[PDB]
Amino acid sequence: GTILLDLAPEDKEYQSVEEEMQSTIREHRDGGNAGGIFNRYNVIRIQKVVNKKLRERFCHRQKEVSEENHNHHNERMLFHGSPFINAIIHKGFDERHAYIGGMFGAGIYFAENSSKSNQYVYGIGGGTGCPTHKDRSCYICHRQMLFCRVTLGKSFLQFSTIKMAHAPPGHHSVIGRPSVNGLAYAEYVIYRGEQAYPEYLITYQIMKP
Numbered sequence: 001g002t003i004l005l006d007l008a009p010e011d012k013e014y015q016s017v018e019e020e021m022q023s024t025i026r027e028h029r030d031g032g033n034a035g036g037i038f039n040r041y042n043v044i045r046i047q048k049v050v051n052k053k054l055r056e057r058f059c060h061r062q063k064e065v066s067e068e069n070h071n072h073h074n075e076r077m078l079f080h081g082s083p084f085i086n087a088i089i090h091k092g093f094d095e096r097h098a099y100i101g102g103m104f105g106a107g108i109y110f111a112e113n114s115s116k117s118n119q120y121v122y123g124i125g126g127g128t129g130c131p132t133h134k135d136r137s138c139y140i141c142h143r144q145m146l147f148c149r150v151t152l153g154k155s156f157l158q159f160s161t162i163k164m165a166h167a168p169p170g171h172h173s174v175i176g177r178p179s180v181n182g183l184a185y186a187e188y189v190i191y192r193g194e195q196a197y198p199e200y201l202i203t204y205q206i207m208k209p
Protein backbone atom coordinates (compact mmCIF):
# COMPACT_ATOMS: atom_id res chain seq x y z
CA GLY A 1 0.00 0.00 0.00
CA THR A 2 3.04 2.25 -0.08
CA ILE A 3 3.26 5.14 -2.52
CA LEU A 4 6.49 7.16 -2.86
CA LEU A 5 5.96 10.79 -3.84
CA ASP A 6 9.06 12.27 -5.39
CA LEU A 7 9.61 15.86 -4.23
CA ALA A 8 10.97 18.46 -6.61
CA PRO A 9 14.23 20.06 -5.46
CA GLU A 10 12.43 23.41 -5.85
CA ASP A 11 9.84 22.29 -3.28
CA LYS A 12 10.25 24.04 0.07
CA GLU A 13 9.45 20.73 1.77
CA TYR A 14 12.40 19.09 -0.03
CA GLN A 15 14.64 22.00 0.98
CA SER A 16 13.47 21.78 4.60
CA VAL A 17 14.41 18.12 4.79
CA GLU A 18 17.76 18.58 3.11
CA GLU A 19 18.55 21.51 5.45
CA GLU A 20 17.86 19.37 8.52
CA MET A 21 19.97 16.62 7.06
CA GLN A 22 22.92 18.85 6.19
CA SER A 23 22.87 21.07 9.28
CA THR A 24 22.87 18.12 11.72
CA ILE A 25 26.12 16.62 10.42
CA ARG A 26 28.72 16.28 13.16
CA GLU A 27 32.33 15.17 13.43
CA HIS A 28 32.30 11.71 14.93
CA ARG A 29 34.64 10.27 17.53
CA ASP A 30 35.65 7.37 15.34
CA GLY A 31 37.41 9.68 12.88
CA GLY A 32 34.99 8.64 10.15
CA ASN A 33 35.49 4.89 10.33
CA ALA A 34 31.82 3.84 10.40
CA GLY A 35 30.18 6.44 8.15
CA GLY A 36 33.02 7.96 6.15
CA ILE A 37 34.85 11.29 5.98
CA PHE A 38 32.63 14.16 4.84
CA ASN A 39 31.15 17.48 5.96
CA ARG A 40 28.37 17.56 3.34
CA TYR A 41 25.97 15.25 1.46
CA ASN A 42 24.96 15.23 -2.18
CA VAL A 43 21.20 14.65 -1.99
CA ILE A 44 19.95 12.74 -5.02
CA ARG A 45 16.29 12.31 -4.20
CA ILE A 46 13.79 12.94 -1.40
CA GLN A 47 10.55 10.97 -1.43
CA LYS A 48 7.51 11.21 0.79
CA VAL A 49 6.31 7.81 2.04
CA VAL A 50 2.56 7.45 1.86
CA ASN A 51 1.02 4.41 3.52
CA LYS A 52 -2.48 4.68 4.96
CA LYS A 53 -2.30 1.51 7.07
CA LEU A 54 1.08 2.37 8.58
CA ARG A 55 -0.12 5.92 9.23
CA GLU A 56 -3.21 4.58 11.03
CA ARG A 57 -1.09 2.34 13.25
CA PHE A 58 1.27 5.19 14.06
CA CYS A 59 -1.55 7.59 14.88
CA HIS A 60 -3.42 5.06 17.03
CA ARG A 61 -0.31 4.42 19.10
CA GLN A 62 0.48 8.12 19.36
CA LYS A 63 -2.96 8.74 20.87
CA GLU A 64 -2.33 5.99 23.43
CA VAL A 65 1.04 7.41 24.41
CA SER A 66 -0.41 10.90 24.63
CA GLU A 67 -3.13 9.71 27.02
CA GLU A 68 -0.50 7.94 29.11
CA ASN A 69 1.77 11.00 29.29
CA HIS A 70 -0.45 13.98 30.25
CA ASN A 71 -1.44 14.56 26.61
CA HIS A 72 2.16 14.96 25.41
CA HIS A 73 3.09 12.35 22.81
CA ASN A 74 6.46 14.13 22.37
CA GLU A 75 6.82 13.53 18.67
CA ARG A 76 10.26 14.32 17.25
CA MET A 77 11.59 14.26 13.71
CA LEU A 78 14.62 11.97 13.79
CA PHE A 79 16.88 10.22 11.29
CA HIS A 80 17.14 6.47 10.86
CA GLY A 81 19.76 4.45 9.01
CA SER A 82 19.92 0.71 8.48
CA PRO A 83 20.13 -1.87 5.69
CA PHE A 84 16.36 -2.40 5.97
CA ILE A 85 14.87 0.74 4.44
CA ASN A 86 13.00 -1.04 1.68
CA ALA A 87 11.21 -3.27 4.19
CA ILE A 88 10.50 -0.35 6.56
CA ILE A 89 8.77 1.81 3.92
CA HIS A 90 6.46 -1.14 3.02
CA LYS A 91 5.74 -2.81 6.38
CA GLY A 92 6.98 -0.30 8.93
CA PHE A 93 9.47 -0.73 11.73
CA ASP A 94 9.17 -4.13 13.46
CA GLU A 95 10.85 -4.63 16.82
CA ARG A 96 10.63 -8.41 16.38
CA HIS A 97 13.80 -7.89 14.32
CA ALA A 98 15.52 -6.03 17.15
CA TYR A 99 17.78 -8.13 19.38
CA ILE A 100 19.06 -7.69 22.88
CA GLY A 101 22.75 -7.22 22.08
CA GLY A 102 22.49 -3.56 21.05
CA MET A 103 23.86 -0.73 23.20
CA PHE A 104 20.35 -0.11 24.55
CA GLY A 105 18.97 -3.54 23.76
CA ALA A 106 16.19 -4.75 21.52
CA GLY A 107 14.91 -1.50 20.11
CA ILE A 108 14.80 0.57 16.94
CA TYR A 109 17.42 3.34 16.95
CA PHE A 110 17.15 6.90 15.74
CA ALA A 111 19.36 9.97 15.83
CA GLU A 112 18.96 13.72 15.86
CA ASN A 113 22.20 13.90 13.83
CA SER A 114 21.94 12.62 10.29
CA SER A 115 25.63 11.70 10.32
CA LYS A 116 24.98 9.33 13.24
CA SER A 117 22.30 7.50 11.20
CA ASN A 118 24.73 7.45 8.28
CA GLN A 119 26.99 5.23 10.44
CA TYR A 120 24.32 2.45 10.28
CA VAL A 121 23.27 2.52 6.62
CA TYR A 122 25.65 -0.27 5.63
CA GLY A 123 25.28 -2.08 8.97
CA ILE A 124 26.29 -1.68 12.61
CA GLY A 125 29.52 0.29 12.68
CA GLY A 126 29.16 0.83 8.94
CA GLY A 127 29.41 -2.89 8.26
CA THR A 128 31.91 -3.58 5.47
CA GLY A 129 30.89 -0.41 3.63
CA CYS A 130 29.34 -0.28 0.18
CA PRO A 131 28.60 -3.51 -1.63
CA THR A 132 30.78 -2.86 -4.66
CA HIS A 133 33.93 -1.28 -3.18
CA LYS A 134 33.71 -2.44 0.47
CA ASP A 135 34.39 1.18 1.45
CA ARG A 136 32.63 2.71 4.45
CA SER A 137 33.73 6.11 3.07
CA CYS A 138 32.62 5.45 -0.50
CA TYR A 139 31.94 8.66 -2.42
CA ILE A 140 30.53 6.85 -5.46
CA CYS A 141 27.80 4.51 -4.26
CA HIS A 142 24.36 5.75 -3.24
CA ARG A 143 23.01 5.57 0.30
CA GLN A 144 19.55 5.87 1.82
CA MET A 145 18.32 7.04 5.18
CA LEU A 146 14.92 7.91 6.61
CA PHE A 147 13.71 11.09 8.27
CA CYS A 148 10.97 9.85 10.57
CA ARG A 149 8.20 10.98 12.90
CA VAL A 150 8.96 9.32 16.22
CA THR A 151 6.61 9.13 19.21
CA LEU A 152 8.82 9.38 22.31
CA GLY A 153 6.24 9.82 25.07
CA LYS A 154 8.04 9.85 28.40
CA SER A 155 11.73 9.17 27.72
CA PHE A 156 14.06 7.35 30.10
CA LEU A 157 17.50 8.99 30.11
CA GLN A 158 20.34 6.48 30.00
CA PHE A 159 24.06 7.34 30.01
CA SER A 160 25.72 3.95 29.54
CA THR A 161 24.93 0.64 27.88
CA ILE A 162 21.99 -1.31 29.27
CA LYS A 163 20.55 -4.13 27.23
CA MET A 164 16.82 -3.89 27.78
CA ALA A 165 13.97 -5.60 25.99
CA HIS A 166 11.29 -2.94 26.49
CA ALA A 167 11.02 0.67 27.61
CA PRO A 168 11.44 0.94 31.38
CA PRO A 169 8.24 0.89 33.49
CA GLY A 170 6.28 4.13 33.08
CA HIS A 171 8.18 5.19 29.97
CA HIS A 172 7.80 4.98 26.18
CA SER A 173 11.34 5.39 24.91
CA VAL A 174 14.98 5.53 25.96
CA ILE A 175 17.46 8.29 25.16
CA GLY A 176 21.14 7.45 25.19
CA ARG A 177 22.42 10.82 26.31
CA PRO A 178 25.86 12.43 25.92
CA SER A 179 27.86 12.49 29.15
CA VAL A 180 31.45 13.15 30.18
CA ASN A 181 33.43 10.01 29.35
CA GLY A 182 30.32 8.66 27.63
CA LEU A 183 28.27 9.15 24.46
CA ALA A 184 28.94 12.16 22.23
CA TYR A 185 25.61 12.39 20.43
CA ALA A 186 22.09 11.43 21.48
CA GLU A 187 20.50 8.19 20.37
CA TYR A 188 16.76 7.64 20.59
CA VAL A 189 15.34 4.15 21.06
CA ILE A 190 11.79 2.85 20.78
CA TYR A 191 10.74 -0.73 21.55
CA ARG A 192 7.49 -0.74 19.54
CA GLY A 193 7.60 -0.29 15.77
CA GLU A 194 4.33 1.65 15.71
CA GLN A 195 6.05 4.56 17.49
CA ALA A 196 7.76 5.62 14.28
CA TYR A 197 6.54 6.57 10.84
CA PRO A 198 9.01 6.68 7.93
CA GLU A 199 7.98 10.07 6.57
CA TYR A 200 10.83 10.84 4.14
CA LEU A 201 13.16 8.60 2.17
CA ILE A 202 16.45 10.33 1.32
CA THR A 203 18.82 9.03 -1.37
CA TYR A 204 22.29 10.58 -1.16
CA GLN A 205 26.04 10.33 -1.40
CA ILE A 206 28.60 11.57 1.08
CA MET A 207 30.87 14.15 -0.52
CA LYS A 208 34.65 14.09 -0.45
CA PRO A 209 36.01 17.13 1.43
Ligand SMILES: CCN(C(=O)C1CCN(S(=O)(=O)c2cc3c(ccn3C(C)=O)cc2Br)CC1)c1cccc(C)c1
Nearest residue numbers: 082084087088092093094095097098108109120123124
Ligand atom coordinates in the same frame (compact mmCIF):
# COMPACT_ATOMS: atom_id res chain seq x y z
C1 LIG B 1 20.32 1.55 13.87
C2 LIG B 1 20.29 0.30 14.64
N1 LIG B 1 19.54 -0.76 13.93
C3 LIG B 1 18.14 -0.80 14.10
O1 LIG B 1 17.57 0.00 14.77
C4 LIG B 1 17.48 -1.97 13.32
C5 LIG B 1 16.23 -2.33 14.17
C6 LIG B 1 15.42 -3.38 13.47
N2 LIG B 1 15.12 -2.85 12.18
S1 LIG B 1 13.62 -2.97 11.63
O2 LIG B 1 13.50 -1.90 10.82
O3 LIG B 1 12.71 -3.12 12.68
C7 LIG B 1 13.63 -4.31 10.41
C8 LIG B 1 14.53 -5.24 10.38
C9 LIG B 1 14.57 -6.25 9.44
C10 LIG B 1 13.67 -6.26 8.53
C11 LIG B 1 13.76 -7.34 7.59
C12 LIG B 1 14.96 -7.98 8.16
N3 LIG B 1 15.36 -7.19 9.32
C13 LIG B 1 16.32 -7.56 9.92
C14 LIG B 1 17.21 -8.78 9.62
O4 LIG B 1 16.72 -7.00 10.85
C15 LIG B 1 12.74 -5.36 8.50
C16 LIG B 1 12.74 -4.42 9.40
BR1 LIG B 1 11.03 -3.69 9.31
C17 LIG B 1 15.99 -2.20 11.27
C18 LIG B 1 16.73 -1.23 12.12
C19 LIG B 1 20.31 -1.65 13.17
C20 LIG B 1 20.94 -1.08 12.22
C21 LIG B 1 21.77 -1.73 11.31
C22 LIG B 1 21.95 -3.04 11.42
C23 LIG B 1 21.26 -3.53 12.43
C24 LIG B 1 21.39 -4.97 12.63
C25 LIG B 1 20.49 -2.93 13.28
Ligand SMILES: [Cl-]
Nearest residue numbers: 010011012013
Ligand atom coordinates in the same frame (compact mmCIF):
# COMPACT_ATOMS: atom_id res chain seq x y z
CL1 LIG C 1 6.87 24.87 -2.03
Ligand SMILES: [Cl-]
Nearest residue numbers: 028029184185
Ligand atom coordinates in the same frame (compact mmCIF):
# COMPACT_ATOMS: atom_id res chain seq x y z
CL1 LIG D 1 30.24 9.79 17.82
Ligand SMILES: [Cl-]
Nearest residue numbers: 044045142203
Ligand atom coordinates in the same frame (compact mmCIF):
# COMPACT_ATOMS: atom_id res chain seq x y z
CL1 LIG E 1 19.77 7.84 -9.53
Ligand SMILES: [Cl-]
Nearest residue numbers: 050051052055
Ligand atom coordinates in the same frame (compact mmCIF):
# COMPACT_ATOMS: atom_id res chain seq x y z
CL1 LIG F 1 0.10 8.62 4.71
Ligand SMILES: [Cl-]
Nearest residue numbers: 084085086087
Ligand atom coordinates in the same frame (compact mmCIF):
# COMPACT_ATOMS: atom_id res chain seq x y z
CL1 LIG G 1 15.11 -4.63 3.18
Ligand SMILES: [Zn+2]
Nearest residue numbers: 130133138141
Ligand atom coordinates in the same frame (compact mmCIF):
# COMPACT_ATOMS: atom_id res chain seq x y z
ZN1 LIG H 1 31.16 2.06 -3.43
